[PDB]
């Protein structure tokens, strides 16, 4: 865990004739959510979603709410411009998603700053790693790029990403240190369920781990079985941990040929597991 990250993920969805577009933002530090804003809430404001954010004072929340409302207005204008660029109907609903944030290196340096958008689920424009140039997906985004070059948007983001972004992330990492600077290793086990009297499903479990990144692979005599492995998406426990499993269906007499390999930041050594009857 030399690198830690902060991300804001915003989703703006137009609903023409059915009100102004809906705007939702969530903030994460690594794999832990810490804030939200929902434009459809009773009193829309940035709110804490981690107990270690409840010690910020009201002026912090006021500033965060103002920034989010300002961004929301820009995104509503952007949805209108994009519909026109693509010659789309005024009646349809469309989605603008944005991601921003920073990766903080172990020495305190900016490893990477991000600002990128997708339109209707496809990459649209992205701040390049140099925080001074842009990558545009098509001519629509090349037009956005020119308007942003004219307004010095890259330099506004570079200032934030190299400064306040990292300072805020540092503060969160200290305030929520006991949650965020932990590496909870997975509790692992292998189960065995016959599927006929000649074959069995071996399932390798990883439970209760944090952060979410993990590798779980079945090997047969050292050979990767990824093509014959059912591997579910890593999923949240709901308690700040994650879960995953992978399974293979094998001939009963070959069961001891199979090993499950688990790698996770919280593990001293990568794990090699087998069905233990």
């Amino acid at each position: 865990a030399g690198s830690h990250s902060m991300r804001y993920f915003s989703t703006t969805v137009s609903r023409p004739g059915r009100g102004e577009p809906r705007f939702i933002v969530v903030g994460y530090v690594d794999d832990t959510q810490f804030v939200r804003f929902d434009s459809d809430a009773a009193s829309p404001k940035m709110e804490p979603r981690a107990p270690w954010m409840e010690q910020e004072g009201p002026e912090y929340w006021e500033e965060q709410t103002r920034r989010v409302k300002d961004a929301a207005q820009t995104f509503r204008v952007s949805l209108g411009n994009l519909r026109g660029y693509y010659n789309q109907s005024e009646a349809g609903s469309h989605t603008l998603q944005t991601m921003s944030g920073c990766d903080l290196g172990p020495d305190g340096r900016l490893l990477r700053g991000y600002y990128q958008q997708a339109y209707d689920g496809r990459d649209y424009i992205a701040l390049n790693e140099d925080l001074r140039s842009w990558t545009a997906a098509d001519e629509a985004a090349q037009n956005t790029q020119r308007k942003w070059e004219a307004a010095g948007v890259a330099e506004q983001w570079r200032a934030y990403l190299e400064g306040e972004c990292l300072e805020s992330l540092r503060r969160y990492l200290e305030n929520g240190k006991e949650t965020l600077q932990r590496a909870e290793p997975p509790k692992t086990h292998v189960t065995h369920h016959p599927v006929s009297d000649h074959e069995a499903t071996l399932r390798c479990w990883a439970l209760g781990f944090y952060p979410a990144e993990i590798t779980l692979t079945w090997q047969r005599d050292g050979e990767d079985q990824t093509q014959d492995t059912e591997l579910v998406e890593t999923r949240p426990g709901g308690d700040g941990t994650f879960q995953k499993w992978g399974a293979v269906v094998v001939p009963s007499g070959e069961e001891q040929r199979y090993t499950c390999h688990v790698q996770h930041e919280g593990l001293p050594e990568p794990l090699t597991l087998r069905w233990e009857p």
Partner: protein, 100 residues
Amino acid sequence: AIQRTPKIQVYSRHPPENGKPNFLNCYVSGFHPSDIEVDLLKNGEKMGKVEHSDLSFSKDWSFYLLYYTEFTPNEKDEYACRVNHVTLSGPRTVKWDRDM
């Protein structure tokens, strides 16, 4: 616009063992656009007290949501998650498989 069908997992927070309070989770992920309907079902009946996470999304911009509720399993009851989305024919029901 890109349309991606939701993946659906229904599972408990902790290993299920009957008479012990636990959490019933339905994780729906990989979908686009963001509008979706999700219910947790006890014996085919819609459950109350079901909360959900704030809308977020993955690196490929697909959305994910956790729906969850307190519950206490036992031998009799069956649970399931029911999801509807514009990529589906109609509401899809996935039963909770409690012995994997």
